[PDB]
Structure formats: structure tokens, C-alpha cells
Design an enzyme around this catalytic site. Sequence first.
Site, short mmCIF file in Angstrom:
data_model
loop_
_atom_site.label_atom_id
_atom_site.label_comp_id
_atom_site.label_asym_id
_atom_site.label_seq_id
_atom_site.Cartn_x
_atom_site.Cartn_y
_atom_site.Cartn_z
N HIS B 26 54.12 54.32 28.76
CA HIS B 26 54.60 53.48 29.86
C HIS B 26 55.95 52.89 29.50
CE1 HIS B 26 50.24 53.71 30.26
NE2 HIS B 26 50.41 53.47 31.55
N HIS B 260 56.75 53.75 35.89
CA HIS B 260 55.66 52.91 35.39
C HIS B 260 54.95 53.53 34.19
CE1 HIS B 260 51.75 50.93 35.04
NE2 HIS B 260 51.24 52.14 35.12
N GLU B 414 32.29 33.52 35.86
CA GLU B 414 31.71 34.16 34.68
C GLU B 414 32.72 35.08 33.99
OE1 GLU B 414 30.32 34.63 37.76
OE2 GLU B 414 28.53 33.29 37.64
N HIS B 477 18.77 38.20 41.72
CA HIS B 477 18.93 37.41 40.51
C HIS B 477 18.22 37.98 39.31
CE1 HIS B 477 20.63 34.61 43.27
NE2 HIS B 477 20.66 33.61 42.41
C1 LIG Z 1 41.15 46.53 35.22
C2 LIG Z 1 42.11 47.66 35.32
N1 LIG Z 1 42.18 48.39 36.48
C3 LIG Z 1 43.04 49.45 36.59
C4 LIG Z 1 43.87 49.78 35.56
C5 LIG Z 1 44.79 50.97 35.75
N2 LIG Z 1 46.19 50.55 35.66
C6 LIG Z 1 47.07 50.37 34.57
S1 LIG Z 1 48.53 49.80 34.81
C7 LIG Z 1 48.12 49.65 36.40
C8 LIG Z 1 49.13 49.13 37.36
C9 LIG Z 1 49.89 47.99 36.76
O1 LIG Z 1 50.76 47.51 37.73
P1 LIG Z 1 51.61 46.30 37.10
O2 LIG Z 1 50.70 45.40 36.30
O3 LIG Z 1 52.42 45.67 38.20
O4 LIG Z 1 52.50 47.04 35.98
P2 LIG Z 1 54.00 47.60 36.09
O5 LIG Z 1 53.95 48.73 37.12
O6 LIG Z 1 54.94 46.58 36.66
O7 LIG Z 1 54.36 48.17 34.74
C10 LIG Z 1 46.84 50.06 36.74
C11 LIG Z 1 46.30 49.99 38.12
C12 LIG Z 1 43.79 49.00 34.37
N3 LIG Z 1 44.53 49.19 33.30
N4 LIG Z 1 42.93 47.94 34.26
C1 LIG Z 2 27.69 35.20 40.74
C2 LIG Z 2 26.78 34.02 40.67
N1 LIG Z 2 26.88 33.15 39.63
C3 LIG Z 2 26.03 32.07 39.52
C4 LIG Z 2 25.08 31.85 40.48
C5 LIG Z 2 24.18 30.65 40.29
N2 LIG Z 2 24.34 29.71 41.41
C6 LIG Z 2 23.75 29.63 42.69
S1 LIG Z 2 24.23 28.53 43.72
C7 LIG Z 2 25.34 28.07 42.58
C8 LIG Z 2 26.25 26.92 42.88
C9 LIG Z 2 26.73 26.98 44.29
O1 LIG Z 2 27.62 25.94 44.48
P1 LIG Z 2 28.14 25.96 46.00
O2 LIG Z 2 28.45 27.38 46.40
O3 LIG Z 2 29.23 24.94 46.14
O4 LIG Z 2 26.80 25.61 46.82
P2 LIG Z 2 26.29 24.19 47.36
O5 LIG Z 2 26.02 23.34 46.12
O6 LIG Z 2 27.37 23.46 48.11
O7 LIG Z 2 25.01 24.42 48.11
C10 LIG Z 2 25.32 28.78 41.39
C11 LIG Z 2 26.25 28.51 40.26
C12 LIG Z 2 25.00 32.77 41.56
N3 LIG Z 2 24.14 32.68 42.55
N4 LIG Z 2 25.85 33.84 41.66
O1 LIG Z 3 47.74 52.06 31.90
C1 LIG Z 3 47.19 52.66 32.79
C2 LIG Z 3 45.73 52.50 33.19
O2 LIG Z 3 44.96 51.67 32.40
C3 LIG Z 3 47.76 53.66 33.77
O3 LIG Z 3 49.16 53.61 33.91
C4 LIG Z 3 47.20 54.94 33.10
O4 LIG Z 3 47.67 54.83 31.80
C5 LIG Z 3 47.57 56.22 33.75
O5 LIG Z 3 46.85 57.26 33.06
C6 LIG Z 3 49.06 56.53 33.66
O6 LIG Z 3 49.71 55.86 34.74
C7 LIG Z 3 49.20 58.02 33.76
O7 LIG Z 3 48.31 58.47 34.76
P1 LIG Z 3 47.58 59.97 34.69
O8 LIG Z 3 48.60 60.93 34.06
O9 LIG Z 3 46.35 59.73 33.81
O10 LIG Z 3 47.27 60.31 36.16
O1 LIG Z 4 20.75 29.97 43.84
C1 LIG Z 4 20.85 29.76 42.66
C2 LIG Z 4 21.34 30.76 41.62
O2 LIG Z 4 21.59 32.04 42.07
C3 LIG Z 4 20.60 28.48 41.88
O3 LIG Z 4 20.61 27.32 42.65
C4 LIG Z 4 19.22 28.89 41.28
O4 LIG Z 4 18.49 29.22 42.41
C5 LIG Z 4 18.57 27.85 40.45
O5 LIG Z 4 17.38 28.47 39.90
C6 LIG Z 4 18.14 26.62 41.23
O6 LIG Z 4 19.27 25.75 41.31
C7 LIG Z 4 17.00 26.00 40.47
O7 LIG Z 4 17.31 26.04 39.10
P1 LIG Z 4 16.14 26.19 37.92
O8 LIG Z 4 14.91 25.42 38.42
O9 LIG Z 4 15.91 27.71 37.85
O10 LIG Z 4 16.79 25.58 36.67
#
Ligand SMILES: Cc1ncc(C[n+]2csc(CCOP(=O)(O)OP(=O)(O)O)c2C)c(N)n1
Ligand SMILES: Cc1ncc(C[n+]2csc(CCOP(=O)(O)OP(=O)(O)O)c2C)c(N)n1
Ligand SMILES: O=C(CO)[C@@H](O)[C@H](O)[C@H](O)[C@H](O)COP(=O)(O)O
Ligand SMILES: O=C(CO)[C@@H](O)[C@H](O)[C@H](O)[C@H](O)COP(=O)(O)O
Lengths: 676, 676
Positions: B26, B260, B414, B477
Site C-alpha cells: 500500500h 491505495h 463491547e 441472549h
Molecule cells: C475491518 C476491516 N474491514 C475491511 C478491511 C479492508 N480494507 C483495507 S484498507 C481498506 C480501505 C481503507 O480506506 P482508508 O482507511 O481511507 O485508507 P486509504 O485509502 O486512505 O489508504 C479496506 C476496506 C480491513 N482492513 N479491515
Molecule cells: C449488544 C448488547 N449488549 C448488552 C446488552 C445488555 N443490555 C440490555 S438492556 C441494556 C441497557 C439498555 O439501556 P437503554 O437502551 O438505555 O434501555 P433503558 O434503560 O432506557 O430501558 C443492556 C446493557 C444487550 N441487550 N445487547
Molecule cells: O489492506 C487491505 C485490506 O485489509 C486492502 O487494501 C487489501 O490489502 C487488498 O488486498 C489490497 O487492496 C489489494 O487487493 P486484492 O489484490 O487482494 O484485490
Molecule cells: O435485556 C437485557 C440484556 O440483554 C438486560 O436488562 C438483561 O435482561 C438483564 O438480565 C436484566 O437487566 C436482569 O439482569 P440479571 O437479573 O440477569 O442480573
Amino acid sequence: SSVDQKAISTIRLLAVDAVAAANSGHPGAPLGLAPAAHAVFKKMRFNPKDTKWINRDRFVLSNGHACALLYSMLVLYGYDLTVEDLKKFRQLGSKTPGHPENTDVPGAEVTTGPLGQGICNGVGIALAQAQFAATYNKPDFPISDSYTYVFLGDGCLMEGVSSEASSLAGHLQLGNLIAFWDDNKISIDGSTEVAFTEDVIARYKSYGWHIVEVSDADTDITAIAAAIDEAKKVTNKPTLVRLTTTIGFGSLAQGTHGVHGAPLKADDIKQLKTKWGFNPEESFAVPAEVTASYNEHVAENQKIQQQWNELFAAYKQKYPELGAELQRRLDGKLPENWDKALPVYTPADAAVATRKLSEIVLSKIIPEVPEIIGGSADLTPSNLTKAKGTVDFQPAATGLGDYSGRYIRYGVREHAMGAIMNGIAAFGANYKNYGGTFLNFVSYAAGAVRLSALSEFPITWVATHDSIGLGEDGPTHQPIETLAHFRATPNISVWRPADGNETSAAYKSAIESTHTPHILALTRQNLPQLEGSSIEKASKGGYTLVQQDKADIIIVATGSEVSLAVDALKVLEGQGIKAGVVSLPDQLTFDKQSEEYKLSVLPDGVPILSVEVMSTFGWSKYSHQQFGLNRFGASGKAPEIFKLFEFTPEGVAERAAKTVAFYKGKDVVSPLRSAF
Amino acid sequence: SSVDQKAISTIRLLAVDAVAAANSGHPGAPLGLAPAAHAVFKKMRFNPKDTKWINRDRFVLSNGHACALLYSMLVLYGYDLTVEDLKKFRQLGSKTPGHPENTDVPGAEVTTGPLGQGICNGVGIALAQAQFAATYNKPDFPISDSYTYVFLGDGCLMEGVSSEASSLAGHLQLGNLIAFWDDNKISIDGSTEVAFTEDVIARYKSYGWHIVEVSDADTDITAIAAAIDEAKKVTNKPTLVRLTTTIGFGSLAQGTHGVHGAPLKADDIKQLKTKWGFNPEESFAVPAEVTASYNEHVAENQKIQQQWNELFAAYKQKYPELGAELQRRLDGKLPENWDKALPVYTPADAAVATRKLSEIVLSKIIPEVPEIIGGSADLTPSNLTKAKGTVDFQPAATGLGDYSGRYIRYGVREHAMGAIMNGIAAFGANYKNYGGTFLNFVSYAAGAVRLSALSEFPITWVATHDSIGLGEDGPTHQPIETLAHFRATPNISVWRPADGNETSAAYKSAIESTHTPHILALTRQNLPQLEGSSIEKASKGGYTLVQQDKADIIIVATGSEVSLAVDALKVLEGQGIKAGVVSLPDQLTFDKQSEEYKLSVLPDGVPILSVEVMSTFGWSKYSHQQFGLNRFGASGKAPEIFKLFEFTPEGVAERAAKTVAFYKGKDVVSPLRSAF
Ligand SMILES: Cc1ncc(C[n+]2csc(CCOP(=O)(O)OP(=O)(O)O)c2C)c(N)n1
Ligand SMILES: Cc1ncc(C[n+]2csc(CCOP(=O)(O)OP(=O)(O)O)c2C)c(N)n1
Ligand SMILES: O=C(CO)[C@@H](O)[C@H](O)[C@H](O)[C@H](O)COP(=O)(O)O
Ligand SMILES: O=C(CO)[C@@H](O)[C@H](O)[C@H](O)[C@H](O)COP(=O)(O)O
Ligand SMILES: [Ca+2]
Ligand SMILES: [Ca+2]
């Protein structure tokens, strides 16, 4: 009015009573969002008796833990869900599971609960609606003009997948998307001040969204309805409506994290009822005036659908070709003999990478099957996912495409691409949609992929650069665990085609699918056309490529390792060992074949060695010994990496010979046999 | 000046020549970012001869595909990387892999290439620096005052993980984080206009970041240096510096996606050299004036470190207790006998969920081991990850914590939590850091988890609610595929402790780890203390819990299913079948034991049945037959789900009896045996 207030109280108390009966679940957000739900559903067009009307407005509960609210709305509107089902909330086998599931819950468009997913699904529903409308609408024929309403909370706004999808939705100017943020300043860990202090509204403006703020969404249903009307006037931006609510509104414990996720205390429920005019001794009350008011809206909606049906009939008269296409799609049927467009190869044809074979398939089938759309997560020239001559899905105002386009530029957004694909599938109309990235980065989208499987959506990942065969990019790009992860997930077809014919079979499966997501693991590097392959045989998921009666060993392989196994067979012949070869392009499809078919491929009485240049997990289902790669890869020219790890004809032959020796004098039964 | 221009040209041409020699990689972003790299490294404090100096500034290349730029800087500054290594760019076994790997590349703080990760790693490095400084700095003793510099591109800004981490970093007011956006308007699919039109700067302001814009970052190194000086004055916000560059600057193909990711044409390289005063016939030129200028900066930095060493010596005199603690941590040693704080249980103690056992462990060991910090992704009261009485990591200005705090409120993030944990580990100083969520949502962070394993970082996921045992929340879940995914990834210890003693062993492993990430799969539901468990035995990863000489079958189980297996043993005794029980709390730890130890646990000559209420993938390594759950779960009371799927003492006994019958008259050898 008074009836509106009674409806809101009814919703709130149904939700709290359902949580109470289960002694499990989430009363807080249902209490806070009941006014908004009441207002939104009154603006929505839907038929409880026809959940699949294609011009319905869609509703998505992205904060799926609040599903007691959704279930209460569905019950009150007379969907195929009753008070008795609410009384079985969170109980084994009920139609009211603790998070909504589209397979089990009538009127649940998608499966939510994993935060962030639903808003992305809504983006995909809205994307599909825009593409569908651009394809079919004509003057005086608004076949598709529906909206996509999404409720989401702070949790969804914290998950990165929603940022990806909101950035893209703003770029795509999706004016029929209207999302509502439950701005209650509470999450599980307490106040949002502890971890979530960003200016959400400013961020959404930076994506190009329109904003409407409702400062008292605990009571101001007039302003919520007006926010919807305002959003509908802004046709070139998705809208975020900020609903400032009190979590658990009305509870003694309102405004606290304690009301988020556990049942209210019994005395709290009593004072809720008395404050709102209900009988504290009664649960699951449904005042008949609420039913009547809701039935009025259903009746109006049913007349709207009846008129839509007549519009569709008139459309088929005025536009017979498009009308027949639309009818076919709404009947869930692909074009007649579409698969005759699938490319077919012979062993005399040149070697081709399966990414390039995939490009060729797409180029032949996209013109034949209008309900195919797809894109790539910023890897279009590497995944080879765009058919030459097609137009990108973009707002025409950009000059870069049109909503009638068929190719989506997802940007570097794999997770949102996965969840958007789920929304496109959820729209219906037979959409068969796909998304390209490198196989190793499908893992970024695991949250959505798992939901594709649980939701039974026929989405397709075009997952190129499948292995160490990609070479120099090295171990951060080379899959090891990836196929094992997705094969271990229920209901995912994971195709790893070895050649041209297998790639066509993989696409035939992916496009015909109605309930099973597909991952197509495709190569960067060229592979030969195999003697013995065909669409017909590969369509069985696993098949005998080289039959050897009197085999000393059978080698089972996938993808790039099938050719390796065939070359190893020749080395083994020189050592006096006779091998057969099985190609296993999709383990799930193979598993679904009859026991007799499977035994014809993996018989008793012969050792079976698997060869695949990634994890050996799962392979004991089909083999006695497994040659795989259970360490990370390396950065170098791909053939040198294969040599380093002894994935060569000689290295495979050596392990095959050791396998024959290991079983000398042993009774060997098929790996398909089991004790239970 | 003239020398600055020559250095920039040298960097650019080293990068292009490395790509050219590999015929892979690159060149574009290295060409565009060479001025910024030159300017940033001149401001950075680092010792090429001591890559682990704890008060060094850190640099992270989040756009890791641009690593020819990083390698060129490291070579020019005299790290343990030479021109000869550059000539081996992207070649098997070289120290210049196609994406930077911290295990292989001196001066690579983290492993990047998967987009979005590096900026999140930088957030974690900066978080650790702030916590470290708050813990140790004293008046006149700035033990830690270093900065974290990150380069990132459009791709990283599109990945949701970077939004999560940038939201959190702004909330945490991390003023020593300075990130640089390569604003070149190009990604793989072409112009960013096709998919990435958001107002990035407005979004970063919404997170609470400071902004500096450099309109001509192709040439204006004065403004880049001034942007760094400005950023250092803003002590309560992370800073984003917008570097407006031309991708591939200088190339005939500058400003295009073609530059790129593929080597430049030979004639393009020639005109690059002549335009900049270099010999077009020469590759890998390093003008001695550039070396000299860079050596001056190294010499100054080495004098800074020498003074830091004397400051540290004086610190140990003035603050003997803190000084000894710091020395111990910099030597990579845990406190002497810290593990005596680990809780120990007997079979007379009450049943306890392993999430609660985990809380108790943390409460005992956090006061004993200051280098433990951690948090939860908005699940603190469910994961039970905070020790009572500790203070949260927050900027003191919020009133909600202090930078000396030890508990991180990650919010619902996460993936960023996973990558931030990697950055905290990368900071060094013996940090043993952890992150809580539900096991099923560790999957949202797979991109980072995989890098924990590849980077060899001792991070720990506190992954509660591990199975259908969580009950009512239902299949969205409940993990099925999750342990198989991570067990199939090289170098992840996946502990699933069955009881109090096993949970202490899991933590002993996680905290002692120096090169292996840990996932602790913990229960919502209560489990009994087991007869036969101990820290000592569980520390072997797998052990014989119930020894039965003359066993008809051995049941191997993990976590919640060990107690089930023990109960099944009693049912089997009533059927005249004698069973042994093996507990396998960590398959990786078990695999690393001696072959003789492993055979003492899983001997020849006896059928072995595995029991674990999730995917059966991997289990054939340890068993002949596998009882698992290969379908999605259900929403209901947990004991009813177990009954539905026949994970009961009777259901296990039935399958054990069928396993004994299936092997009657067969010769059975240990699953640990293999042909190669
Ligand atoms: C999570 C993830 N998804 C896809 C790719 C594939 N990939 C590598 S570079 C790139 C594009 C990067 O664009 P940018 O960060 O703007 O780099 P630049 O073209 O300016 O060098 C992609 C899609 C990757 N490396 N990681
Ligand atoms: C990807 C993911 N991570 C964690 C959870 C656990 N979980 C369920 S509800 C919740 C919090 C939700 O907060 P919010 O969306 O503001 O709901 P509200 O308290 O207002 O009901 C979490 C962390 C989940 N359901 N999904
Ligand atoms: O860095 C990344 C992806 O993680 C991309 O640019 C990746 O290296 C691609 O392979 C290059 O762009 C070249 O692409 P290709 O020859 O594999 O089609
Ligand atoms: O909806 C979600 C997570 O996906 C959370 O609220 C999840 O249901 C939790 O279990 C509840 O908040 C209750 O928590 P706990 O009794 O399992 O500690
Ligand atoms: Ca909230
Ligand atoms: Ca770019």
C-alpha cells in the site's frame, strides 16, 4: 382524548402486568414509551389480519428488552396475539418471548434484543422500500410509499453498529425513516452521565439527519404526532425524534435504573392502577373503549389496504410486465428457470479464483432476477461484487446513482451491512440481498450474522480472501476460526466452493433460500476446474468427486483444498495407496441430505481424513483424522505459506499414509454414526 | 528544513521501494502521511534502543495497511529494524509483515490492519497512562506524562468500533490522546463521496473532542507541529487533527483509489525520485543527513530517558512504598503471594453462581494487586464486576470518579471495550485488565478479541450469563456457538469454571497470564460446590473430579454441566453403570499439559461422553460422543429449558448408557490419540 389517555394507561399496565406475571422482564422503557407507541401506531398503516401487506408501514423496537410494550400494542390492535399470550410472557413455548422474534411473534418484523440491531434493520427496511418504490411506482401508481418507524434507546446509540448505519442512512437521504430516541438518561449502570455524555443530537445532524425534539414525551402525544408530520415533510433526510421521557413513568421508582430490568413491587403496581383510574385488584385490564378506538384505526387501515389491492390490480392492467414481476415477487417465487443463467464449466476451462467466478455468476443472474441487490463494505474491486453496467443505489440528488440502483456502497461498515441486509430481507418482496467483505472481517458483523440465522433471513455474505491463500496481507487478514464459528451457529449455510460449478451451486442455494442465511467463502487465488464437479452434485452440499471402490482412505476437503486433495491422490498412488476424494462445499446442506445419501459419500469401513486450511473444529463430524491450520497465519507469498504449513500434495499424502497406518487392524465406521 | 524535506522524501521513497520490492502492499497513505509522520516523530519521546521505556510517547498506526510508512520511520530512527528488513517487506518470516504485529515488529505497540482497532487501542493506551499517572505521580515527580499519537484513515472512521471509543474517550476527557485523520477523500471503492459524506469534524465535536485542521498536510509540517502544541494545551479533551492530504502525493496516480493498495508503476517511481532530487536508478536510499538529523533527536530522547531513570531513583527514595510497587510492576512481577487472597471453598459451602464467585474473587484480589483495573459494558450490576468501595475511572471534573479510579464504565460498547483493553495491556506496567459483558455479546467484539490472541495480550473478559441457564431473556441472549468460536481461535484461554474453587483457578490463570487472553464464561444461576475440586487441580485446565477405576464411561463436562454429570453418575449407578467425571474448565490450559497428564485424565480403553449445553464443535478432541446444544435456545424459566433439551440427570444417563452400548465389543482408544 380521554380515550387516548386511557389507551396509554392500558398499554402501560398491560406491560407491567405481563412483567409481573412472569416475575421477569423490563417495565421501565414500556412505561416511558407508551405515549409514543400510542401516537406512532395511530399514524401507522398496518393490517393485523395481514402482517405481510407490502405497503404497510413498518415498526421496529430496537430496544427489544421493552417488548412488553410491543406485545401490548399487538394485542390491543388484534394481531394474532392475545391477553392469554401476554399472561405467558417469558414462559417456555409462548408467543411472547423475553425479546421479540420475527419467527414466533406476529407483527415483529425483525428479531431484536441485541442492542443496536433494530435501528440498522430499520435502515435496511427503508433502503429496500426506497429501492422497491423506485423500481415499481409509476404516475398515479404509488405502489410503495410506506414509512419505517424505529424506537431505540441509549444502549442502541452507544453500540457502534448504529453509528455505522446512521452515517450511511444520512448519506442515502432515507426520508421515509423516522427513528425515536428514548431519551431517559438511564441505562443499566445508572445515569448516562457516567458513560454517555456526547451530544447525540449534534452527532445526528453531522450524519445529515433531521431532528425533532419532544421535551415532554411522558404526556405530549400532540407533539409526538406533530413530529411525525414534520418528519414526513423532510423527504431527503432520515429523522431522529428525541423523546425526553422518564423511565418507568408513574412508578414509585421512576427515573432510576432499578425500573429498567426487574418487575415492579406489588404495591407500586397498585398505586399505578389507582393513579390512572384502574382497579388495583385487576390485572390485564383492557377497557372496551380502547379496543373500540383501536379497532376504528384498524378498520381505516384495512380500507386503505383494500384500495391498495385495487391500485395493484389497475397497475397490472396499465403496466403488465412490471405488474407480473411484482406479483411473482409477492408470491415468493423466483423467475421461471432463472437458474439457466448460472454459468457452467468443464475441466477443460481455465483456472479462476472463486471471487472471480462469483463476479461472473452475479453478472449473469442480476439481469435475470430483479429482486437481487447487494453491495460491499468498501471492497468492491477486491470482492468483485458489482456487475458491470449496473447503477449504484444512491439518492439521485447526489449524481452518483439512483434509488432504482442495485449496488450498495456500504463503506467500511461490515456490522451495519449485516444488519441492513437483515432489514432488506425483512422488507419482503422476495429480496435476495448480498454483502461483500473479506471472510476474516465477517467477524466484525457477528452480532448481525447470528440474527440472520435466528431470524431465518435469506441473506448472503460474499466473503472473499478466505484463507492463507490471500498471501501477503498476513495473519490479521487470514481466517482460522471463522468457518468454525459460523458452522457452529445453527442455520447458517457456509459454502466454500472449489471451482466454477461449485460456485454456481452455492449461488443457486443462496438465491433459492427462503429461511437460511448463506456465507460464501471465496478465494483470492486461482483454482482449477475439477474433473467430476457439477452444479447438480455440488447442490447436495457434499458429494463424491473421485470415487475409488477399494479406497484405502477417503480425503474430504472444501474449496481450495479439493484440488490439493486430488493432487495428493496422485502422490499416494505412487506410494501404493488408493484414495477417494469427497468435496464438501456446504456442511449444512450436506447434513440435511438423507442418511443413505450421506453414507454413500462417507461410508463405513474406510478411514477418512479432512483437509481444510483453517480450524479443525467441526470436522470430526465427517472424518476420523483432520489436517487443518489451528495457528495464525503469516505474511508472505501464498504458495510459500502453504509450503510452510505442509499443505502440499506431499504433506497431505504423508498424513493420509499415517492415517492408513493408524487404522491398520482396526474396525472403522463412518464418522456419521453416533450413539444417540 | 532542506533536511526536513529530504527526510520526508526519504520516508516516501523507502515506503514506495518496499512496496515495489514485494510487488505487494500500500503506497498511497504512506506517500500522503510522510510529512505528518516526520513531524509527529520529531515531537515524540522514544528510545529505539529501549522500546519499553514506560514514559515514552506511544504511536499507533490505526490505518495499518500504511505500515511501510511505520517501518520506514523505525528504520530511519535506528530501531531493531534495518533497510535489509525493509527489502523483505511482506516476505515470509520477515520482520516487516504486510500489517504491523506487535509480537514481530520492534516499535509496533499493537497489531493493526483490521480497521478501527488502532484508534481504540490508542484510547486504551491513553486511559492506562492517565490511570498510571494518577496512581504514581507526586509533586516534582512526573513519573508518567506521555502522549498517545494515533494515525487513522477514513476506513477507521467508518468502523463503528471507533465511534464507540471516541465517544468514550471524549467523555473521559483524555487530553493526552492526539489523533490524526488522514483526510484524503479516497477509500478502496473510490471517492468518499460514494459512502462517507458525514461531517466528521462536527461528529468529533459532539463527542467532546478538540479539533485542529491542517488544510495542506502534504507540505505544512509547521502547521502539523503547531497542531500538536495546540493539542497539548487542551488538557481536558482528546484532539483530532484533520490532515488534508493527497493520497499517493507525488505519484502520477496521486488522488486516486488505484494508489491505495497496489505497487506503483516503475516509471512512476522514477519520476518521484527525480522530482525530489533522488537517483531514479537507486532503491532504498538513506541520505546520511537524514540519519544524522534523526540521530540527534534520538540522542536528545535518550538523555530524557536517562533523566527519567534518575527521577525514578529519587522517587524510590522519597516514596519508598510506591517506588517498590512501581519497580515490581516494571519488572513484570505480581505481588509476592498475591494468590493467597484467592477464595477457597469446600463441598460444605453454599451454592453460588459463578458470576457471584467472580465478584468475590475480584473483591479479594483488587486490594492486593494494584495493576488490576477493569470495567463492564453497561452490565455492572449483572456481571458483578465492581468491587465494593472502589472508585470509578472518570475525570475528577465530573465528580463521578477520578483518574486514580480502578473501575471503568464502558457503556454499551463491547467492541471498543475489547480494543481498549488491548491498549491498556499494551501500555505495559503489568496491567491486568478486564471487561464484563454477557458471553453472547462478547461476539460483538470479535474483531478485537481475535487481536488480543494474535497480539498475545493478557486481557480478561468477564463473560456472564453463559448459557440457556440465564432463562427468560431467551435465544437472542443465550450462547450456542460462542465458546466454539473462541476455542477455535489460537491462543485464547476459555475458562468455564464449575464452582468456587474453579473460579479462583480461572482468575489465577487470567491474572498470571502474560501472553494469553482469557474469557471467563460465568453463570447467572447458582451451582453447588463440588466434591473433588480445588484451585490446584483446576489450574491444570482439565482434571479427574470423580475417579472410577473400572469405569464403563467417563463423562467430561464444563461449568454448570459438571454438577449435572455428577448427578447423572448417581442415576447411572442405579442402572448398573459406573461412571467417572472429568471437569475441563479450560481446554487450552489442558492442552498445554504433558501427554502423560492428559492421558491420566482421558485414558485409553473407556468411552468418553462430553456434556456442555452449547455447540459440540471441538469436543471430539476430548470425547468419543458429544451431548451438546446445536440449536438456538428458548425464552422460559431456565430449569424448564434444561428439561426441554434433556440436560437432566436422566437425559445424560440415557446418552451415557447408549454410549456404553455403542462401544460394546469395540476397542476404544483415548480421543487424545491421533495419526499425526
Ligand atoms: C475491518 C476491516 N474491514 C475491511 C478491511 C479492508 N480494507 C483495507 S484498507 C481498506 C480501505 C481503507 O480506506 P482508508 O482507511 O481511507 O485508507 P486509504 O485509502 O486512505 O489508504 C479496506 C476496506 C480491513 N482492513 N479491515
Ligand atoms: C449488544 C448488547 N449488549 C448488552 C446488552 C445488555 N443490555 C440490555 S438492556 C441494556 C441497557 C439498555 O439501556 P437503554 O437502551 O438505555 O434501555 P433503558 O434503560 O432506557 O430501558 C443492556 C446493557 C444487550 N441487550 N445487547
Ligand atoms: O489492506 C487491505 C485490506 O485489509 C486492502 O487494501 C487489501 O490489502 C487488498 O488486498 C489490497 O487492496 C489489494 O487487493 P486484492 O489484490 O487482494 O484485490
Ligand atoms: O435485556 C437485557 C440484556 O440483554 C438486560 O436488562 C438483561 O435482561 C438483564 O438480565 C436484566 O437487566 C436482569 O439482569 P440479571 O437479573 O440477569 O442480573
Ligand atoms: Ca436509557
Ligand atoms: Ca482514505
